[PDB]
Amino acid sequence: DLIPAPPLSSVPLQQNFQDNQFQGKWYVVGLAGNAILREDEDPQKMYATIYELKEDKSYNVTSVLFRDGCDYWIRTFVPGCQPGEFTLGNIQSYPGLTSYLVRVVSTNYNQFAMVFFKKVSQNQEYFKITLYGRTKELTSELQENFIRFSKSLGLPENNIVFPVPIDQCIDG
């Protein structure tokens, strides 16, 4: 009894998405989804994601996280059906991962973004929304819009966290 993924008709797409302006480092300031839980003796720690636009218009996408120590994982997001949407490249290479979808919901490129993800993995549907910031903090107002958007997708307050800013790893 995991919360079902919302229909896609409920997830907006950023109008006139600009791939070149979305490049760069984004810090995950907010995180919400059906497998995310407000854990208090091990609160989630902030991580970063770096997007890099290639000649073929896919992104190299690199996640940097603290764990023992630092992990850097690089993946490929391939432009999907409509601008702002992507699929995961080389999906054959991820075991038990059946599908993966990304949709940029909104962004102003130089301050924040909200991005929606939905995947099917070991035969289960998982989704999440990240609130990306170009810095490690954002306004209260942008946090509230993120919370409201998340609730609009069926998530209660417990499935929404704000990762604590850190210095190890994520900046190198």
Residue numbers in the entry: 6 to 72, 74 to 178
Give excerpts from the publication:
We have previously studied an endogenous protein, called LCN2, also known as Neutrophil Gelatinase Associated Lipocalin (NGAL) or Siderocalin (Scn), which has several characteristics useful for the safe excretion of iron. Second, LCN2 captures catecholates, which in turn bind iron; these are produced by Gram negative bacteria, such as the siderophore Enterochelin (Ent), and potentially by mammals, such as the catechol metabolites of amino acids and dietary polyphenols. The ligation of Ent:Fe3+ by LCN2 is a critical step in bacteriostasis because sequestration of Ent:Fe3+ reduces iron transport to bacteria and limits their growth. Fifth, the kidney captures the majority of circulating LCN2 (50–70%) via filtration followed by reabsorption from the lumen of the proximal tubule, whereupon it is degraded.
Hence, to identify residues required for megalin binding, we mutated 18 positively charged amino acids on the surface of LCN2, based on information from its crystal structure (K15, 46, 50, 59, 62, 73, 74, 75, 98, 118, 142, 149, 157; H165; and R43, 72, 130, 140). We found 13 LCN2 mutants that could load with Ent:55Fe and then could traffic through the kidney into the urine, particularly K3 (19% of input). To define the structural basis for iron trafficking by K3, we solved its crystal structure. Views of the molecular surfaces of LCN2 (top) and K3 (bottom) coloured according to electrostatic potentials, showed the large effect on the chemical character of LCN2 by the resurfacing mutations. Nonetheless, superposition of native and K3 structures demonstrated a high degree of overall structural conservation, including complete conservation of the ligand-binding site. In other words, neither the fold nor the ligand-binding site of LCN2 were affected by the mutation of surface residues, allowing K3 and K3Cys to efficiently traffic Ent:iron. The addition of native or K3, however completely blocked the Ent- or catechol-mediated conversion of Fe+3 to Fe+2 (P<0.05±LCN2 with either Ent or catechol:iron, Student's t-test; n=3 each) and the subsequent oxidation of HPF to fluorescein (P<10−7, Student's t-test, n=3, across all points). In sum, biochemical, cellular and animal data, suggested the hypothesis that K3 and K3Cys bypassed the proximal tubule as a result of a failure to recognize megalin. Fortunately, K3 maintains almost all structural and functional features of the native protein permitting iron transport.
